[PDB]
PDB file of all heavy atoms in Angstrom:
ATOM      1  N   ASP R   1      -0.195  -9.212   9.538  1.00  0.00           N
ATOM      2  CA  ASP R   1       0.338 -10.555   9.420  1.00  0.00           C
ATOM      3  C   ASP R   1      -0.606 -11.598  10.011  1.00  0.00           C
ATOM      4  O   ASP R   1      -0.912 -11.582  11.198  1.00  0.00           O
ATOM      5  CB  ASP R   1       1.701 -10.601  10.100  1.00  0.00           C
ATOM      6  CG  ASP R   1       2.211 -11.997  10.267  1.00  0.00           C
ATOM      7  OD1 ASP R   1       1.973 -12.806   9.338  1.00  0.00           O
ATOM      8  OD2 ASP R   1       2.851 -12.274  11.318  1.00  0.00           O
ATOM      9  N   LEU R   2      -1.056 -12.514   9.171  1.00  0.00           N
ATOM     10  CA  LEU R   2      -1.985 -13.528   9.604  1.00  0.00           C
ATOM     11  C   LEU R   2      -1.405 -14.432  10.672  1.00  0.00           C
ATOM     12  O   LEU R   2      -2.079 -14.737  11.646  1.00  0.00           O
ATOM     13  CB  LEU R   2      -2.468 -14.322   8.388  1.00  0.00           C
ATOM     14  CG  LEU R   2      -3.745 -15.177   8.467  1.00  0.00           C
ATOM     15  CD1 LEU R   2      -4.754 -14.558   9.375  1.00  0.00           C
ATOM     16  CD2 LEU R   2      -4.329 -15.337   7.092  1.00  0.00           C
ATOM     17  N   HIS R   3      -0.162 -14.858  10.516  1.00  0.00           N
ATOM     18  CA  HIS R   3       0.439 -15.717  11.526  1.00  0.00           C
ATOM     19  C   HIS R   3       1.159 -14.972  12.645  1.00  0.00           C
ATOM     20  O   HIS R   3       1.542 -13.827  12.497  1.00  0.00           O
ATOM     21  CB  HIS R   3       1.346 -16.739  10.860  1.00  0.00           C
ATOM     22  CG  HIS R   3       0.628 -17.997  10.487  1.00  0.00           C
ATOM     23  ND1 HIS R   3      -0.547 -17.995   9.768  1.00  0.00           N
ATOM     24  CD2 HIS R   3       0.885 -19.294  10.785  1.00  0.00           C
ATOM     25  CE1 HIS R   3      -0.987 -19.234   9.641  1.00  0.00           C
ATOM     26  NE2 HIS R   3      -0.138 -20.042  10.249  1.00  0.00           N
ATOM     27  N   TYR R   4       1.343 -15.644  13.770  1.00  0.00           N
ATOM     28  CA  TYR R   4       1.944 -15.051  14.959  1.00  0.00           C
ATOM     29  C   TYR R   4       0.973 -13.964  15.432  1.00  0.00           C
ATOM     30  O   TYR R   4       0.569 -13.109  14.641  1.00  0.00           O
ATOM     31  CB  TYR R   4       3.306 -14.438  14.657  1.00  0.00           C
ATOM     32  CG  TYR R   4       4.136 -14.365  15.908  1.00  0.00           C
ATOM     33  CD1 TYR R   4       4.859 -15.472  16.343  1.00  0.00           C
ATOM     34  CD2 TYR R   4       4.124 -13.227  16.713  1.00  0.00           C
ATOM     35  CE1 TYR R   4       5.550 -15.456  17.557  1.00  0.00           C
ATOM     36  CE2 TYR R   4       4.810 -13.197  17.927  1.00  0.00           C
ATOM     37  CZ  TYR R   4       5.518 -14.313  18.344  1.00  0.00           C
ATOM     38  OH  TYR R   4       6.184 -14.277  19.548  1.00  0.00           O
ATOM     39  N   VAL R   5       0.597 -13.988  16.712  1.00  0.00           N
ATOM     40  CA  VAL R   5      -0.372 -13.010  17.222  1.00  0.00           C
ATOM     41  C   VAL R   5       0.097 -11.870  18.130  1.00  0.00           C
ATOM     42  O   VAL R   5       1.099 -11.971  18.846  1.00  0.00           O
ATOM     43  CB  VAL R   5      -1.552 -13.743  17.902  1.00  0.00           C
ATOM     44  CG1 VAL R   5      -2.584 -12.740  18.479  1.00  0.00           C
ATOM     45  CG2 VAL R   5      -2.173 -14.657  16.879  1.00  0.00           C
ATOM     46  N   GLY R   6      -0.668 -10.780  18.069  1.00  0.00           N
ATOM     47  CA  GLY R   6      -0.394  -9.588  18.842  1.00  0.00           C
ATOM     48  C   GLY R   6      -1.494  -8.571  18.588  1.00  0.00           C
ATOM     49  O   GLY R   6      -1.298  -7.352  18.718  1.00  0.00           O
ATOM     50  N   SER R   7      -2.657  -9.079  18.189  1.00  0.00           N
ATOM     51  CA  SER R   7      -3.805  -8.230  17.935  1.00  0.00           C
ATOM     52  C   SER R   7      -3.388  -7.015  17.149  1.00  0.00           C
ATOM     53  O   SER R   7      -3.055  -7.123  15.980  1.00  0.00           O
ATOM     54  CB  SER R   7      -4.400  -7.772  19.259  1.00  0.00           C
ATOM     55  OG  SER R   7      -3.473  -6.970  19.974  1.00  0.00           O
ATOM     56  N   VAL R   8      -3.404  -5.864  17.817  1.00  0.00           N
ATOM     57  CA  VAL R   8      -3.032  -4.595  17.207  1.00  0.00           C
ATOM     58  C   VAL R   8      -1.830  -4.032  17.923  1.00  0.00           C
ATOM     59  O   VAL R   8      -1.896  -3.773  19.116  1.00  0.00           O
ATOM     60  CB  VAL R   8      -4.153  -3.544  17.320  1.00  0.00           C
ATOM     61  CG1 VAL R   8      -3.828  -2.337  16.433  1.00  0.00           C
ATOM     62  CG2 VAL R   8      -5.472  -4.160  16.939  1.00  0.00           C
ATOM     63  N   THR R   9      -0.740  -3.843  17.193  1.00  0.00           N
ATOM     64  CA  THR R   9       0.467  -3.302  17.779  1.00  0.00           C
ATOM     65  C   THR R   9       0.507  -1.828  17.402  1.00  0.00           C
ATOM     66  O   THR R   9       0.568  -1.487  16.220  1.00  0.00           O
ATOM     67  CB  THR R   9       1.716  -4.029  17.240  1.00  0.00           C
ATOM     68  OG1 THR R   9       1.679  -4.043  15.809  1.00  0.00           O
ATOM     69  CG2 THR R   9       1.764  -5.463  17.743  1.00  0.00           C
ATOM     70  N   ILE R  10       0.474  -0.953  18.403  1.00  0.00           N
ATOM     71  CA  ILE R  10       0.467   0.482  18.153  1.00  0.00           C
ATOM     72  C   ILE R  10       1.761   1.219  18.518  1.00  0.00           C
ATOM     73  O   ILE R  10       2.472   0.814  19.428  1.00  0.00           O
ATOM     74  CB  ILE R  10      -0.704   1.135  18.894  1.00  0.00           C
ATOM     75  CG1 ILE R  10      -1.979   0.318  18.661  1.00  0.00           C
ATOM     76  CG2 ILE R  10      -0.904   2.552  18.389  1.00  0.00           C
ATOM     77  CD1 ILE R  10      -3.188   0.851  19.381  1.00  0.00           C
ATOM     78  N   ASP R  11       2.055   2.298  17.790  1.00  0.00           N
ATOM     79  CA  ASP R  11       3.250   3.115  18.026  1.00  0.00           C
ATOM     80  C   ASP R  11       3.220   3.560  19.486  1.00  0.00           C
ATOM     81  O   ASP R  11       2.244   4.156  19.935  1.00  0.00           O
ATOM     82  CB  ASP R  11       3.245   4.347  17.091  1.00  0.00           C
ATOM     83  CG  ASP R  11       4.490   5.259  17.267  1.00  0.00           C
ATOM     84  OD1 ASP R  11       4.800   5.656  18.417  1.00  0.00           O
ATOM     85  OD2 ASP R  11       5.149   5.598  16.252  1.00  0.00           O
ATOM     86  N   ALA R  12       4.286   3.269  20.218  1.00  0.00           N
ATOM     87  CA  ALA R  12       4.356   3.631  21.623  1.00  0.00           C
ATOM     88  C   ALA R  12       3.751   5.000  21.883  1.00  0.00           C
ATOM     89  O   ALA R  12       2.817   5.136  22.673  1.00  0.00           O
ATOM     90  CB  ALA R  12       5.796   3.607  22.093  1.00  0.00           C
ATOM     91  N   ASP R  13       4.285   6.010  21.196  1.00  0.00           N
ATOM     92  CA  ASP R  13       3.835   7.395  21.339  1.00  0.00           C
ATOM     93  C   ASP R  13       2.328   7.513  21.267  1.00  0.00           C
ATOM     94  O   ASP R  13       1.708   8.256  22.025  1.00  0.00           O
ATOM     95  CB  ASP R  13       4.492   8.262  20.269  1.00  0.00           C
ATOM     96  CG  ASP R  13       6.009   8.289  20.404  1.00  0.00           C
ATOM     97  OD1 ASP R  13       6.521   8.761  21.444  1.00  0.00           O
ATOM     98  OD2 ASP R  13       6.695   7.827  19.472  1.00  0.00           O
ATOM     99  N   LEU R  14       1.737   6.762  20.354  1.00  0.00           N
ATOM    100  CA  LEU R  14       0.300   6.790  20.211  1.00  0.00           C
ATOM    101  C   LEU R  14      -0.383   6.208  21.446  1.00  0.00           C
ATOM    102  O   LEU R  14      -1.376   6.756  21.915  1.00  0.00           O
ATOM    103  CB  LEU R  14      -0.129   6.017  18.954  1.00  0.00           C
ATOM    104  CG  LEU R  14       0.153   6.637  17.580  1.00  0.00           C
ATOM    105  CD1 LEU R  14      -0.364   5.708  16.493  1.00  0.00           C
ATOM    106  CD2 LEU R  14      -0.512   8.019  17.469  1.00  0.00           C
ATOM    107  N   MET R  15       0.145   5.113  21.984  1.00  0.00           N
ATOM    108  CA  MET R  15      -0.475   4.496  23.147  1.00  0.00           C
ATOM    109  C   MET R  15      -0.437   5.393  24.382  1.00  0.00           C
ATOM    110  O   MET R  15      -1.347   5.381  25.211  1.00  0.00           O
ATOM    111  CB  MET R  15       0.176   3.143  23.431  1.00  0.00           C
ATOM    112  CG  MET R  15      -0.189   2.096  22.390  1.00  0.00           C
ATOM    113  SD  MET R  15       0.289   0.402  22.806  1.00  0.00           S
ATOM    114  CE  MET R  15      -1.003  -0.006  24.076  1.00  0.00           C
ATOM    115  N   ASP R  16       0.613   6.189  24.493  1.00  0.00           N
ATOM    116  CA  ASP R  16       0.747   7.089  25.625  1.00  0.00           C
ATOM    117  C   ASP R  16      -0.125   8.292  25.341  1.00  0.00           C
ATOM    118  O   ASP R  16      -0.838   8.779  26.225  1.00  0.00           O
ATOM    119  CB  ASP R  16       2.195   7.541  25.781  1.00  0.00           C
ATOM    120  CG  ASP R  16       3.164   6.375  25.823  1.00  0.00           C
ATOM    121  OD1 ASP R  16       2.919   5.422  26.610  1.00  0.00           O
ATOM    122  OD2 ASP R  16       4.176   6.409  25.082  1.00  0.00           O
ATOM    123  N   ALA R  17      -0.063   8.764  24.095  1.00  0.00           N
ATOM    124  CA  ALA R  17      -0.834   9.931  23.663  1.00  0.00           C
ATOM    125  C   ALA R  17      -2.306   9.678  23.874  1.00  0.00           C
ATOM    126  O   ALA R  17      -3.035  10.524  24.407  1.00  0.00           O
ATOM    127  CB  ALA R  17      -0.566  10.230  22.189  1.00  0.00           C
ATOM    128  N   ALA R  18      -2.729   8.491  23.455  1.00  0.00           N
ATOM    129  CA  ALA R  18      -4.118   8.080  23.567  1.00  0.00           C
ATOM    130  C   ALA R  18      -4.338   7.340  24.870  1.00  0.00           C
ATOM    131  O   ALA R  18      -5.415   6.833  25.128  1.00  0.00           O
ATOM    132  CB  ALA R  18      -4.511   7.198  22.372  1.00  0.00           C
ATOM    133  N   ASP R  19      -3.310   7.285  25.701  1.00  0.00           N
ATOM    134  CA  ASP R  19      -3.432   6.612  26.980  1.00  0.00           C
ATOM    135  C   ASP R  19      -4.051   5.236  26.809  1.00  0.00           C
ATOM    136  O   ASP R  19      -5.253   5.046  26.969  1.00  0.00           O
ATOM    137  CB  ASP R  19      -4.283   7.449  27.942  1.00  0.00           C
ATOM    138  CG  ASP R  19      -4.565   6.727  29.250  1.00  0.00           C
ATOM    139  OD1 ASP R  19      -3.592   6.264  29.894  1.00  0.00           O
ATOM    140  OD2 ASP R  19      -5.755   6.628  29.627  1.00  0.00           O
ATOM    141  N   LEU R  20      -3.206   4.281  26.473  1.00  0.00           N
ATOM    142  CA  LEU R  20      -3.618   2.907  26.281  1.00  0.00           C
ATOM    143  C   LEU R  20      -2.498   2.107  26.918  1.00  0.00           C
ATOM    144  O   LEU R  20      -1.333   2.500  26.815  1.00  0.00           O
ATOM    145  CB  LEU R  20      -3.703   2.586  24.786  1.00  0.00           C
ATOM    146  CG  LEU R  20      -4.809   3.268  23.992  1.00  0.00           C
ATOM    147  CD1 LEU R  20      -4.568   3.130  22.519  1.00  0.00           C
ATOM    148  CD2 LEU R  20      -6.118   2.638  24.353  1.00  0.00           C
ATOM    149  N   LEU R  21      -2.835   1.003  27.581  1.00  0.00           N
ATOM    150  CA  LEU R  21      -1.820   0.161  28.222  1.00  0.00           C
ATOM    151  C   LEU R  21      -1.625  -1.103  27.413  1.00  0.00           C
ATOM    152  O   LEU R  21      -2.584  -1.651  26.884  1.00  0.00           O
ATOM    153  CB  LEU R  21      -2.241  -0.216  29.646  1.00  0.00           C
ATOM    154  CG  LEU R  21      -2.679   0.943  30.544  1.00  0.00           C
ATOM    155  CD1 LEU R  21      -3.068   0.427  31.914  1.00  0.00           C
ATOM    156  CD2 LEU R  21      -1.564   1.942  30.662  1.00  0.00           C
ATOM    157  N   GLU R  22      -0.386  -1.557  27.296  1.00  0.00           N
ATOM    158  CA  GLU R  22      -0.136  -2.785  26.560  1.00  0.00           C
ATOM    159  C   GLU R  22      -1.051  -3.809  27.199  1.00  0.00           C
ATOM    160  O   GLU R  22      -0.901  -4.130  28.371  1.00  0.00           O
ATOM    161  CB  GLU R  22       1.324  -3.213  26.700  1.00  0.00           C
ATOM    162  CG  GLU R  22       1.607  -4.549  26.053  1.00  0.00           C
ATOM    163  CD  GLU R  22       3.078  -4.792  25.834  1.00  0.00           C
ATOM    164  OE1 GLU R  22       3.672  -4.080  24.992  1.00  0.00           O
ATOM    165  OE2 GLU R  22       3.641  -5.693  26.502  1.00  0.00           O
ATOM    166  N   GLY R  23      -2.005  -4.314  26.430  1.00  0.00           N
ATOM    167  CA  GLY R  23      -2.971  -5.254  26.978  1.00  0.00           C
ATOM    168  C   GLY R  23      -4.171  -4.433  27.448  1.00  0.00           C
ATOM    169  O   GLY R  23      -4.222  -3.955  28.588  1.00  0.00           O
ATOM    170  N   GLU R  24      -5.131  -4.241  26.556  1.00  0.00           N
ATOM    171  CA  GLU R  24      -6.306  -3.448  26.865  1.00  0.00           C
ATOM    172  C   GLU R  24      -7.256  -3.581  25.667  1.00  0.00           C
ATOM    173  O   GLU R  24      -6.859  -3.399  24.511  1.00  0.00           O
ATOM    174  CB  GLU R  24      -5.914  -1.972  27.069  1.00  0.00           C
ATOM    175  CG  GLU R  24      -6.928  -1.154  27.891  1.00  0.00           C
ATOM    176  CD  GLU R  24      -6.827   0.362  27.678  1.00  0.00           C
ATOM    177  OE1 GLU R  24      -5.716   0.883  27.438  1.00  0.00           O
ATOM    178  OE2 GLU R  24      -7.875   1.032  27.773  1.00  0.00           O
ATOM    179  N   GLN R  25      -8.513  -3.908  25.948  1.00  0.00           N
ATOM    180  CA  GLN R  25      -9.506  -4.077  24.902  1.00  0.00           C
ATOM    181  C   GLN R  25      -9.588  -2.842  24.048  1.00  0.00           C
ATOM    182  O   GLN R  25      -9.818  -1.740  24.541  1.00  0.00           O
ATOM    183  CB  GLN R  25     -10.871  -4.365  25.510  1.00  0.00           C
ATOM    184  CG  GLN R  25     -11.708  -5.318  24.698  1.00  0.00           C
ATOM    185  CD  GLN R  25     -12.977  -5.731  25.407  1.00  0.00           C
ATOM    186  OE1 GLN R  25     -13.932  -4.950  25.509  1.00  0.00           O
ATOM    187  NE2 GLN R  25     -12.994  -6.968  25.916  1.00  0.00           N
ATOM    188  N   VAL R  26      -9.394  -3.035  22.757  1.00  0.00           N
ATOM    189  CA  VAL R  26      -9.442  -1.938  21.805  1.00  0.00           C
ATOM    190  C   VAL R  26     -10.354  -2.320  20.666  1.00  0.00           C
ATOM    191  O   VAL R  26     -10.393  -3.463  20.251  1.00  0.00           O
ATOM    192  CB  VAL R  26      -8.042  -1.625  21.246  1.00  0.00           C
ATOM    193  CG1 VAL R  26      -8.140  -0.603  20.130  1.00  0.00           C
ATOM    194  CG2 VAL R  26      -7.147  -1.120  22.368  1.00  0.00           C
ATOM    195  N   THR R  27     -11.098  -1.355  20.168  1.00  0.00           N
ATOM    196  CA  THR R  27     -12.005  -1.617  19.079  1.00  0.00           C
ATOM    197  C   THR R  27     -11.454  -0.976  17.827  1.00  0.00           C
ATOM    198  O   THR R  27     -10.861   0.096  17.876  1.00  0.00           O
ATOM    199  CB  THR R  27     -13.391  -1.050  19.370  1.00  0.00           C
ATOM    200  OG1 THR R  27     -14.002  -1.804  20.432  1.00  0.00           O
ATOM    201  CG2 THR R  27     -14.254  -1.089  18.109  1.00  0.00           C
ATOM    202  N   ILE R  28     -11.648  -1.657  16.708  1.00  0.00           N
ATOM    203  CA  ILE R  28     -11.181  -1.179  15.424  1.00  0.00           C
ATOM    204  C   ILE R  28     -12.334  -1.071  14.455  1.00  0.00           C
ATOM    205  O   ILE R  28     -13.188  -1.935  14.389  1.00  0.00           O
ATOM    206  CB  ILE R  28     -10.142  -2.128  14.802  1.00  0.00           C
ATOM    207  CG1 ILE R  28      -8.920  -2.245  15.702  1.00  0.00           C
ATOM    208  CG2 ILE R  28      -9.723  -1.596  13.452  1.00  0.00           C
ATOM    209  CD1 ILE R  28      -7.777  -2.974  15.063  1.00  0.00           C
ATOM    210  N   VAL R  29     -12.368   0.008  13.708  1.00  0.00           N
ATOM    211  CA  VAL R  29     -13.409   0.170  12.719  1.00  0.00           C
ATOM    212  C   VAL R  29     -12.670   0.648  11.472  1.00  0.00           C
ATOM    213  O   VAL R  29     -11.931   1.638  11.503  1.00  0.00           O
ATOM    214  CB  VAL R  29     -14.484   1.158  13.200  1.00  0.00           C
ATOM    215  CG1 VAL R  29     -15.114   0.631  14.486  1.00  0.00           C
ATOM    216  CG2 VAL R  29     -13.878   2.531  13.418  1.00  0.00           C
ATOM    217  N   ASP R  30     -12.844  -0.106  10.393  1.00  0.00           N
ATOM    218  CA  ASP R  30     -12.176   0.141   9.120  1.00  0.00           C
ATOM    219  C   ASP R  30     -12.985   1.018   8.175  1.00  0.00           C
ATOM    220  O   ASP R  30     -13.962   0.556   7.585  1.00  0.00           O
ATOM    221  CB  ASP R  30     -11.878  -1.210   8.465  1.00  0.00           C
ATOM    222  CG  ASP R  30     -11.082  -1.085   7.188  1.00  0.00           C
ATOM    223  OD1 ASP R  30     -11.290  -0.121   6.413  1.00  0.00           O
ATOM    224  OD2 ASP R  30     -10.242  -1.980   6.959  1.00  0.00           O
ATOM    225  N   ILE R  31     -12.567   2.274   8.019  1.00  0.00           N
ATOM    226  CA  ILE R  31     -13.256   3.227   7.148  1.00  0.00           C
ATOM    227  C   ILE R  31     -13.424   2.744   5.699  1.00  0.00           C
ATOM    228  O   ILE R  31     -14.459   2.977   5.075  1.00  0.00           O
ATOM    229  CB  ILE R  31     -12.517   4.582   7.125  1.00  0.00           C
ATOM    230  CG1 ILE R  31     -12.672   5.296   8.465  1.00  0.00           C
ATOM    231  CG2 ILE R  31     -13.059   5.446   6.001  1.00  0.00           C
ATOM    232  CD1 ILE R  31     -11.893   4.699   9.572  1.00  0.00           C
ATOM    233  N   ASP R  32     -12.404   2.068   5.176  1.00  0.00           N
ATOM    234  CA  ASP R  32     -12.442   1.576   3.813  1.00  0.00           C
ATOM    235  C   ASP R  32     -13.418   0.425   3.629  1.00  0.00           C
ATOM    236  O   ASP R  32     -14.023   0.292   2.562  1.00  0.00           O
ATOM    237  CB  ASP R  32     -11.051   1.122   3.359  1.00  0.00           C
ATOM    238  CG  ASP R  32      -9.976   2.175   3.592  1.00  0.00           C
ATOM    239  OD1 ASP R  32      -9.475   2.257   4.731  1.00  0.00           O
ATOM    240  OD2 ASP R  32      -9.632   2.925   2.647  1.00  0.00           O
ATOM    241  N   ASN R  33     -13.580  -0.414   4.648  1.00  0.00           N
ATOM    242  CA  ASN R  33     -14.488  -1.549   4.506  1.00  0.00           C
ATOM    243  C   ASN R  33     -15.413  -1.874   5.674  1.00  0.00           C
ATOM    244  O   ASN R  33     -15.832  -3.021   5.833  1.00  0.00           O
ATOM    245  CB  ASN R  33     -13.715  -2.821   4.118  1.00  0.00           C
ATOM    246  CG  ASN R  33     -12.828  -3.334   5.231  1.00  0.00           C
ATOM    247  OD1 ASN R  33     -13.272  -3.524   6.350  1.00  0.00           O
ATOM    248  ND2 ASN R  33     -11.567  -3.574   4.919  1.00  0.00           N
ATOM    249  N   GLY R  34     -15.743  -0.881   6.481  1.00  0.00           N
ATOM    250  CA  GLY R  34     -16.652  -1.112   7.584  1.00  0.00           C
ATOM    251  C   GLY R  34     -16.459  -2.331   8.471  1.00  0.00           C
ATOM    252  O   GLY R  34     -17.411  -2.819   9.058  1.00  0.00           O
ATOM    253  N   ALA R  35     -15.247  -2.836   8.593  1.00  0.00           N
ATOM    254  CA  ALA R  35     -15.040  -3.984   9.469  1.00  0.00           C
ATOM    255  C   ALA R  35     -15.118  -3.546  10.945  1.00  0.00           C
ATOM    256  O   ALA R  35     -15.043  -2.353  11.253  1.00  0.00           O
ATOM    257  CB  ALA R  35     -13.682  -4.624   9.183  1.00  0.00           C
ATOM    258  N   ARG R  36     -15.267  -4.508  11.856  1.00  0.00           N
ATOM    259  CA  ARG R  36     -15.348  -4.181  13.273  1.00  0.00           C
ATOM    260  C   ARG R  36     -14.820  -5.311  14.166  1.00  0.00           C
ATOM    261  O   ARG R  36     -15.380  -6.402  14.194  1.00  0.00           O
ATOM    262  CB  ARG R  36     -16.797  -3.824  13.619  1.00  0.00           C
ATOM    263  CG  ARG R  36     -17.341  -2.657  12.797  1.00  0.00           C
ATOM    264  CD  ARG R  36     -18.653  -2.101  13.332  1.00  0.00           C
ATOM    265  NE  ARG R  36     -18.720  -0.662  13.080  1.00  0.00           N
ATOM    266  CZ  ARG R  36     -18.741   0.273  14.030  1.00  0.00           C
ATOM    267  NH1 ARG R  36     -18.712  -0.078  15.305  1.00  0.00           N
ATOM    268  NH2 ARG R  36     -18.763   1.563  13.703  1.00  0.00           N
ATOM    269  N   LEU R  37     -13.740  -5.034  14.895  1.00  0.00           N
ATOM    270  CA  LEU R  37     -13.114  -6.021  15.773  1.00  0.00           C
ATOM    271  C   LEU R  37     -12.945  -5.540  17.198  1.00  0.00           C
ATOM    272  O   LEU R  37     -12.973  -4.344  17.478  1.00  0.00           O
ATOM    273  CB  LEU R  37     -11.723  -6.362  15.269  1.00  0.00           C
ATOM    274  CG  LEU R  37     -11.612  -6.614  13.785  1.00  0.00           C
ATOM    275  CD1 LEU R  37     -10.161  -6.735  13.393  1.00  0.00           C
ATOM    276  CD2 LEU R  37     -12.380  -7.864  13.455  1.00  0.00           C
ATOM    277  N   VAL R  38     -12.734  -6.486  18.097  1.00  0.00           N
ATOM    278  CA  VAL R  38     -12.517  -6.154  19.483  1.00  0.00           C
ATOM    279  C   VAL R  38     -11.319  -6.981  19.888  1.00  0.00           C
ATOM    280  O   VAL R  38     -11.347  -8.203  19.780  1.00  0.00           O
ATOM    281  CB  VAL R  38     -13.720  -6.535  20.333  1.00  0.00           C
ATOM    282  CG1 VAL R  38     -13.454  -6.187  21.783  1.00  0.00           C
ATOM    283  CG2 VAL R  38     -14.955  -5.816  19.822  1.00  0.00           C
ATOM    284  N   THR R  39     -10.259  -6.323  20.339  1.00  0.00           N
ATOM    285  CA  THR R  39      -9.055  -7.032  20.734  1.00  0.00           C
ATOM    286  C   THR R  39      -8.177  -6.225  21.694  1.00  0.00           C
ATOM    287  O   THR R  39      -8.527  -5.109  22.068  1.00  0.00           O
ATOM    288  CB  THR R  39      -8.257  -7.381  19.490  1.00  0.00           C
ATOM    289  OG1 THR R  39      -7.033  -8.008  19.871  1.00  0.00           O
ATOM    290  CG2 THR R  39      -7.973  -6.134  18.691  1.00  0.00           C
ATOM    291  N   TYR R  40      -7.048  -6.795  22.115  1.00  0.00           N
ATOM    292  CA  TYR R  40      -6.124  -6.080  23.008  1.00  0.00           C
ATOM    293  C   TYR R  40      -5.135  -5.249  22.189  1.00  0.00           C
ATOM    294  O   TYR R  40      -5.083  -5.363  20.970  1.00  0.00           O
ATOM    295  CB  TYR R  40      -5.353  -7.050  23.896  1.00  0.00           C
ATOM    296  CG  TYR R  40      -4.605  -8.114  23.145  1.00  0.00           C
ATOM    297  CD1 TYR R  40      -3.224  -8.119  23.124  1.00  0.00           C
ATOM    298  CD2 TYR R  40      -5.273  -9.141  22.484  1.00  0.00           C
ATOM    299  CE1 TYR R  40      -2.505  -9.129  22.466  1.00  0.00           C
ATOM    300  CE2 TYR R  40      -4.566 -10.159  21.821  1.00  0.00           C
ATOM    301  CZ  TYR R  40      -3.179 -10.144  21.816  1.00  0.00           C
ATOM    302  OH  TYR R  40      -2.462 -11.121  21.151  1.00  0.00           O
ATOM    303  N   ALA R  41      -4.358  -4.402  22.848  1.00  0.00           N
ATOM    304  CA  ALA R  41      -3.400  -3.572  22.130  1.00  0.00           C
ATOM    305  C   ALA R  41      -1.986  -3.885  22.549  1.00  0.00           C
ATOM    306  O   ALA R  41      -1.719  -4.101  23.722  1.00  0.00           O
ATOM    307  CB  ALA R  41      -3.685  -2.117  22.380  1.00  0.00           C
ATOM    308  N   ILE R  42      -1.078  -3.894  21.581  1.00  0.00           N
ATOM    309  CA  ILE R  42       0.331  -4.183  21.830  1.00  0.00           C
ATOM    310  C   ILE R  42       1.243  -3.004  21.498  1.00  0.00           C
ATOM    311  O   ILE R  42       1.181  -2.449  20.405  1.00  0.00           O
ATOM    312  CB  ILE R  42       0.791  -5.399  21.008  1.00  0.00           C
ATOM    313  CG1 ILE R  42       0.163  -6.666  21.588  1.00  0.00           C
ATOM    314  CG2 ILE R  42       2.302  -5.493  21.006  1.00  0.00           C
ATOM    315  CD1 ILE R  42       0.776  -7.961  21.086  1.00  0.00           C
ATOM    316  N   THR R  43       2.107  -2.643  22.443  1.00  0.00           N
ATOM    317  CA  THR R  43       3.051  -1.531  22.274  1.00  0.00           C
ATOM    318  C   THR R  43       4.119  -1.776  21.205  1.00  0.00           C
ATOM    319  O   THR R  43       4.979  -2.642  21.366  1.00  0.00           O
ATOM    320  CB  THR R  43       3.797  -1.222  23.590  1.00  0.00           C
ATOM    321  OG1 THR R  43       2.859  -1.115  24.669  1.00  0.00           O
ATOM    322  CG2 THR R  43       4.544   0.082  23.473  1.00  0.00           C
ATOM    323  N   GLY R  44       4.051  -0.998  20.124  1.00  0.00           N
ATOM    324  CA  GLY R  44       5.012  -1.101  19.036  1.00  0.00           C
ATOM    325  C   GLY R  44       6.120  -0.074  19.221  1.00  0.00           C
ATOM    326  O   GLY R  44       6.132   0.644  20.223  1.00  0.00           O
TER     327      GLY R  44
END
């Protein structure tokens, strides 16, 4: 969603599984289109 912000909202289970805290620099790399971002993570 372009409007309203929350960077990347991740499935709670995933954040615990991958040990990530709500609010933490996370990098994203898009396999389909080689994009690359740096942002915080939000508990979904």
Side-chain angles (χ1 to χ4, degrees):
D1 169 37
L2 198 33
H3 270 51
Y4 204 83
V5 179
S7 64
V8 191
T9 51
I10 313 178
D11 181 308
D13 298 298
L14 288 180
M15 289 191 75
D16 308 310
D19 174 53
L20 292 166
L21 309 180
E22 175 163 292
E24 202 201 328
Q25 215 172 74
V26 173
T27 291
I28 299 189
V29 300
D30 185 324
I31 290 72
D32 309 82
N33 69 52
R36 302 193 147 245
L37 315 172
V38 179
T39 177
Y40 55 112
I42 289 194
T43 311

